[PDB]
Design an enzyme around this catalytic site. Structure first.
Site, PDB file in Angstrom:
ATOM      1  N   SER A   1     -11.308  27.258 -22.681  1.00  0.00           N
ATOM      2  CA  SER A   1     -12.712  27.841 -22.859  1.00  0.00           C
ATOM      3  C   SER A   1     -12.671  29.348 -22.845  1.00  0.00           C
ATOM      4  O   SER A   1     -12.045  30.126 -22.553  1.00  0.00           O
ATOM      5  CB  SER A   1     -13.354  27.833 -21.439  1.00  0.00           C
ATOM      6  OG  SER A   1     -13.273  26.188 -21.080  1.00  0.00           O
TER       7      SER A   1
ATOM      8  N   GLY B   1      -8.688  25.223 -20.078  1.00  0.00           N
ATOM      9  CA  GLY B   1      -8.048  26.520 -20.104  1.00  0.00           C
ATOM     10  C   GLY B   1      -8.047  27.062 -21.499  1.00  0.00           C
ATOM     11  O   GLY B   1      -7.666  28.232 -21.795  1.00  0.00           O
TER      12      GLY B   1
ATOM     13  N   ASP C   1     -23.962  29.727 -23.409  1.00  0.00           N
ATOM     14  CA  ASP C   1     -22.492  30.048 -22.774  1.00  0.00           C
ATOM     15  C   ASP C   1     -21.938  31.067 -23.757  1.00  0.00           C
ATOM     16  O   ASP C   1     -21.044  30.754 -24.513  1.00  0.00           O
ATOM     17  CB  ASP C   1     -21.738  28.777 -22.525  1.00  0.00           C
ATOM     18  CG  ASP C   1     -20.544  28.939 -21.764  1.00  0.00           C
ATOM     19  OD1 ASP C   1     -20.509  29.857 -20.763  1.00  0.00           O
ATOM     20  OD2 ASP C   1     -19.934  27.953 -21.713  1.00  0.00           O
TER      21      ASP C   1
ATOM     22  N   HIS D   1     -19.372  31.281 -18.570  1.00  0.00           N
ATOM     23  CA  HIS D   1     -18.921  30.616 -17.242  1.00  0.00           C
ATOM     24  C   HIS D   1     -17.455  31.164 -16.849  1.00  0.00           C
ATOM     25  O   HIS D   1     -16.909  30.722 -15.616  1.00  0.00           O
ATOM     26  CB  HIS D   1     -18.636  28.929 -17.367  1.00  0.00           C
ATOM     27  CG  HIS D   1     -17.494  28.657 -18.324  1.00  0.00           C
ATOM     28  ND1 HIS D   1     -17.857  28.268 -19.563  1.00  0.00           N
ATOM     29  CD2 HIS D   1     -16.298  28.335 -18.146  1.00  0.00           C
ATOM     30  CE1 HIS D   1     -16.599  27.869 -19.835  1.00  0.00           C
ATOM     31  NE2 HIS D   1     -15.699  27.704 -19.185  1.00  0.00           N
TER      32      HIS D   1
END
Ligand code: CA
Length: 228
Positions: A180, A178, A88, A41
């Protein structure tokens, strides 16, 4: 990173960061010389990976600013379905090979899946508070525990797959916005990648959710084991 502390500088030499200009986008992990692993993402057309960093503003001296020439999300990752976070994962190929040492160095992929109660480490520049955000200048570290999947599933009903792993803390240590794409390290190996979580961060009842890396070994290794 909630409930943590400022990391010892360059004690996570694999930590990376995705910048567009001076704007910090996501965390990242150096899994190969020219290869950075992050969350899907975080995908952007153009960005730069920063390595060997501690203070965002201040010059630490290891810093290496290397552009990415290829972005490879997981083919089964879906940006359409929001709140379907499955798969992800993204690998970012760096134009240049990173200069390595004690300050910068790739981390081994975990070749074992983890077990409940396993104590791990998360790091990132994401907000140190929640819901009222505080984005620190220095990298923060926190110790977390691997949650069993069924506690993970019950925490986020219907939203958990086998490609995810839950990690949480009673004392409030959790990844947040932040962080991720950053590392989840268990026994000195890369167990996961920070994916998503609850609002607010650091809830005793809601653990952080990380992409389970032991499940993606053959896909990562294939891409980073290529001639690129
Ligand atoms: Ca710096």
């Amino acid at each position: 990173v909630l409930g943590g502390h400022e990391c010892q500088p360059h004690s996570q030499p694999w930590q990376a960061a995705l910048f567009q200009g001076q704007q910090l986008l996501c965390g990242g992990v150096l899994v190969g010389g020219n290869w950075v692993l992050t969350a899907a993402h975080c995908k952007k057309p153009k960005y730069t990976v920063r390595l060997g960093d501690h203070s965002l503003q201040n010059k630490d001296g290891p810093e290496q600013e290397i552009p990415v020439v290829q972005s490879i999300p997981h083919p089964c990752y879906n940006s359409s379905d929001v709140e379907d976070h499955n798969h992800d994962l993204m690998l970012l190929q760096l134009r240049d090979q990173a200069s390595l040492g004690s300050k910068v160095k790739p981390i081994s992929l975990a070749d074992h899946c983890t077990q409940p109660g396993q104590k791990c480490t998360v790091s990132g520049w994401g907000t140190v508070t929640s819901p009222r955000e505080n984005f620190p200048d220095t990298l923060n570290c926190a110790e977390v525990k691997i949650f069993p999947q069924k506690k993970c599933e019950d925490a986020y009903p219907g939203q958990i797959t086998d490609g995810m792993v839950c990690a949480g803390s009673s004392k409030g240590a959790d990844t947040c916005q932040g962080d991720s794409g950053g590392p989840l390290v268990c026994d000195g190996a890369l167990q996961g990648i920070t994916s998503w979580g609850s609002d607010p961060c650091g809830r005793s009842d809601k653990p952080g959710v990380y992409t389970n890396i032991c499940r993606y070994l053959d896909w990562i290794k294939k891409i980073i084991g290529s001639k690129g």
